[PDB]
């Protein structure tokens, strides 16, 4: 409201009147917290597609690493 003559949380209905994507590796003991993938955080035009591709790549790499772990253990 007016600054000089000081209406806190008037309930401001925002439903009467009218997605985000992360790098998929925020919380994972295998994904390094620090890495060059951090630079993906400053991409805007194709953020959805770039992060989707990154998520797919990390999914596949983790799955293949786990498959090798199981194969090495069993062999």
């Amino acid at each position: 409201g007016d600054i000089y003559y000081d209406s806190l949380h008037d309930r401001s209905p925002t439903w009467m009147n009218e997605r985000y994507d992360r790098l998929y590796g925020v919380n994972h003991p295998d994904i390094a917290k620090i890495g060059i993938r951090r630079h993906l955080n400053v991409e805007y035009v194709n953020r959805k597609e770039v992060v989707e591709r990154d998520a797919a790549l990390m999914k596949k790499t983790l799955s293949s690493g786990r498959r090798l772990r199981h194969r090495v253990e069993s062999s």
Binding site: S7, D10, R11, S12, P13
Partner: peptide, 12 residues
């Protein structure tokens, strides 16, 4: 206080 529409119509 007043909501947005209440304020709008009071000003009207």
């Amino acid at each position: 206080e007043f909501d947005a529409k209440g304020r709008e119509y009071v000003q009207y």
